[model samples]
Target: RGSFVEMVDNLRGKSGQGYYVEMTVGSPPQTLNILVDTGSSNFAVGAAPHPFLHRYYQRQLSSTYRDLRKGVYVPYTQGKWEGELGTDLVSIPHGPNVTVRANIAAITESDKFFINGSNWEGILGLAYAEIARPDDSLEPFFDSLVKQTHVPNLFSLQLCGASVGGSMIIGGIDHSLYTGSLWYTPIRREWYYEVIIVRVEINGQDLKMDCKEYNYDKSIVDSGTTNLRLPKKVFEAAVASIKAASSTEKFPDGFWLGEQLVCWQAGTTPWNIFPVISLYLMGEVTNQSFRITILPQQYLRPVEDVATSQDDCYKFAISQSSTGTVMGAVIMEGFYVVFDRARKRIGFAVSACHVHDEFRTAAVEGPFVTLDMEDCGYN
Candidate 1:
């Protein structure tokens, strides 16, 4: 059909937890909602039908399906899956009528991956091609789409937070979704959207930790994670600083660990008492710095169920990172992110969907802090 693979359009919409797009695969075309994950590089789909999944790819039905006869598997913090490698025609009916020959991991078996309330049957990785499974053989979905269609090697995303609609634009940026200038940080590597964070500040007060501590392992912008995950060292220092700058009441350790729930009256919830968090990302300058700020709303979880005295229940959304500093949805929902892969940079602009101006929880501010550090992201 002439409707496929002309212009990359908005994949469209999100759900309760993760944002997923329905993609059509195979010759006659079978559609499934797949999670859009930037943290990994695998276009994986459920080959076998399960209770939670509405439908599956059923390889037997696709006339053009080819068996790669190879095995593949991926592990995650919450779940893991083992699948078989296969090749098929993948198409996006929501966008420019698009189809491409892609390497797909048809998940034959999984553990805790397709839990209830989950409407997605797969994950569509948007990272680089080098990180694809069976690296020497498989080609990433996006990577193939680029070569097959010859579109610009870039994309922009604006997640509408808890709202109904969000967007993912392949091949460009949309200025209408954000205002003011875009703040950019150079990408340190190709494997991940890696960057270097020089420091963090709480309510304009510096954390006073070594600059290198921010990127001790590596810093990545992952949209898949639900919270802003900080490394162990950074997490401890940040919690102490935020406590000193904001709250007066004492909270149990479980509260900050993202394991416990705390409730406050509707009129007494201390959204104002919490301090704003700012991340100073490395910019190509001598002493100037760039950073983005996260207000209280982005990090606080509002419990919708369990009416206890008809009061509001809240939980902390920030969590501890296992590898490095992961700027996840909690922080990203504050901005309209630009994955400018062609130029090797990541851009952030204040999203239009955030709270009102007076109650605005997300901010893009930079080139203000004076840190004369050189070894920021690499040698």
Candidate 2:
């Protein structure tokens, strides 16, 4: 019988950055805020003081701190952080009293970390161990948890509206938090929770994608990113479809390459007027498929322009990237997601706020186990 920990999304400070969790490390326990990211596999703490830097992990304060004398570099979309590899006692509050010595990156140097003045001090990657740094000889935080505590090798996430209410359940799934049925799909790749996208649909019809020079169609389900990113040509085609469907006037100044912001009259019902975007994804191993629906409220979020004092403009959370399609936080907010590493699969269902939700026996049997669609609450 294992327990789970729940952490609030710290993006409530209007930072509009990313979801974060507060954790303690060291002997006496130095509390620090870190971003909850499933896209990468690195836990790094900021060293120097910056505008967005809130509180950093002080190596000197922790009695359990040990520097491995090794160095590593991590690169992000806009910046990179280089630091020393080390280990220390890490603790997660409000869940378990168990503390474990874990591998961590003590960031001594950074270039455009963009964490300046932000509430989070660092990032805690939740992806598989294959992507962990140093090639070999590295165990991630969750791996350590499984070995040190009675926790299972899994985690669940449910993100809601702008910093409203979300919870990250480590080691188990909260069945009460999701309604209908949980659809299961196998991980195409362990690197980034990748899955095969069978097709991309706009409205009820399948939308034709102009797959540029790139051929393979896959998407990385990333909780760290705030916006959706698609290949250049595919994104252009999607945007064109949205424009034709909604007849929305593109905002003149808000237009930035992939960050396109459009506007319509105030009090307009977007879901009623615009077409819904659907992503049909199939599991490479399980041969199971599920469709994730993105409502207008999820994609067409309102953004106020302080200069014009107009809130009519809505930010289209989808963007274009050379890195291909990344199913980011925007679309994830509407569903409950399970990242099951042991069985190498991911499950999704409509999110529910069931306070009675609790951990259960492992829901999966094996790598090839097919999830019963009849057991799924939704058809």
Candidate 3:
């Protein structure tokens, strides 16, 4: 019951590289490849030279029909792509042929932004957009759909790794995928569930890392990240300490970057394993600290003859490595992260147990395997 897109394409050329979306839309079965992103709120397609939006009723078909051309433009952090927004007769599997209305965001003449070709057609704003917009730039697509679709929608995302299958999900709660009570963080009703970060601590050390008023749009959370994101200074500080921790026998170092994640590994020794990482919120829940488990990584050992000390543990594992960045979906993995559009309030219900399937990346592969290489350059 994992939610998935039909296609994920890799666009490479002078522009570096990026991923775009192409899913089925239109009543007859118009499946267009669109750019996918959670950063924006609405699900939009491309409005090229044609006067109307395109349609694809089935998997096998050529350009046949188009929706009424109504221009609607939304700005993005990168820049702005504009076109029209309207509801056309679109067919959604299991779902009705409800008006499939989406903005036809514009694209460049060059096909470089997408994999399909010059069309540059795609979808942006991938997050559950049901929540109120934090600003004019964003809207909640999921927040709106959940209220209108009656039927439930699921989103399953899978990334890369030798053994990792990725994550799967369905409607309702997948208690097995998450831990603890969904930590309720207060947010501005108008903005996307953006929580004001109060504190981030490692163990009880109270890194004193405090962001009194800094706020981030919750939509930015990418389940794809294995590590957590913090202010630049704090992230650097944490990495320094982890790096400075006496590079000894049990602590080897190795690194990997995938799916917008950069991670390293240290020995499985008690010192590293027992470290408690926590997040504290502002408002009524300021004192409560939410602790997250550390993701383990494998280590390698140097040649035995070249080593003097009997610390094969160091050879086996690195001293300190970044676990992975924490994407929003991964943080919301199992719990019932309700998108209450009517009330404009987000509720979290911590699961009584974890659902093994939600974390089973194997069943739902495809698009999730595609990743952003921006963070992978350090290697």
Candidate 4:
């Protein structure tokens, strides 16, 4: 069993993006704050200057750092990166001082990377080797560790929304971090830790949805993505539901919610003012249904207006994506997720973070046991 690594949230208390975890690279070990991303498999560091405090990788300083003299370019939904591919001794803070000499990309140029102002210095991709760029033969950082010895083949994430810190369990699960049974959903595709959403429901009204290919209703659970994404039809329906419940004004054409900072007159009490959305997923083997609930406050996040400097910008965290649905951190913060690669499944349950006492007590006690919602005294 590996140790618990602490991961801090970004975007202030709103968590507009994701969490940042600490890692060290090269022989002398330069401490770096990198984003924990499961969406892609390209572990690179350093490039453009970060808006917030961050440590850029200096290859000359590390004895073990060596550039492969190869240029690599990778693209994501929000950004694109071009850099040099190389290998170095990567150190994870837990598990008998676990260190793996693995392949890494050192960024030279970054275009449209939204992480400029973000406190995170780089990204740690935790997906299959199929999606790794430049050279797929080079194993990902986590896969290298898993292939070595005694490293847990699984990683668990317990993300607490806002500024509160969260925990990441590398190698094993933290029983106390989540409640209810770990509902397992089989990974549908190899590129991502994908899962099939059986159906979506709002206000007890079921929105008929079925699992399909990438161009259809397919969805992937990504920790890197900040907001939730739905198909055009689903997004329109969701927005309509939200508007009907809150009587909030819709954004005019030639304008978007998050992109243009479009806001409305939904006052300060958006949580009580909005409605909840529930997603039902199909179990891997049992074909059973597992439920994940998204609260109103999670979607209707409030941000300060760029001009007014007041909390007038209330943006719906859910957006329409042509690439299909992406269940991002906004929806994931509500649960404890276990990415079991060996088992080819993902386990999810309501996170214990909602209860301060229960979470704090569990933190103090080494390896606390997580109880289901029924026994946890939380409704």
What TM-score would each prediction reach against the true structure?
0.91, 0.83, 0.52, 0.83
**Residue 197's C-alpha lDDT in candidate 3?**
44
lDDT of each: 0.77, 0.68, 0.35, 0.67
lDDT of 4 by residue, 298-376 (tens): 6655565257645466566788888677888777777888899988898887787742221121111111221221221
The global Cα lDDT (0 to 1) of model 2 is 0.68
How well is each residue in 1-379 modelled by candidate 2, as lDDT tens digits?
Answer: 2234344332232325677777888889988877888887888888666556767778888899999989998776798889898999998774456789988898888888755446778888887678888664587788888898887788888776543457787777776667777777767667778765555667766665432212234467898887777777777777777767776644453453435666667765445656667766554444455677766666666665446645477676878877757778766776788888888888887776312112211121112322432222111
Per-prediction count of colliding residue pairs? 6, 11, 67, 4
Best by TM-score: 1
Candidate 2 segments whose C-alpha is farther than 4 A from its true place? 1-15, 209-218, 248-260, 263-269, 283-288, 304-308, 353-379
What does candidate 1's lDDT look like per residue over 78-176, in tens digits?
898899998899986565456788888999899988757666788998888777776845778887888899667787777766524466777777677
Selected candidate, larger TM-score, 2 vs 3 = 2
Pick by TM-score: 1 or 4, better one: 1
Please give the distance, in angstroms, between residue 366's alpha carbon in candidate 4 and its true position after superposition.
29
* By TM-score: ranked, best first: 1, 2, 4, 3
CA deviation > 4 Å runs, candidate 1:
1-16, 305-310, 369-373
For candidate 2, the per-residue lDDT at 240 reads 72
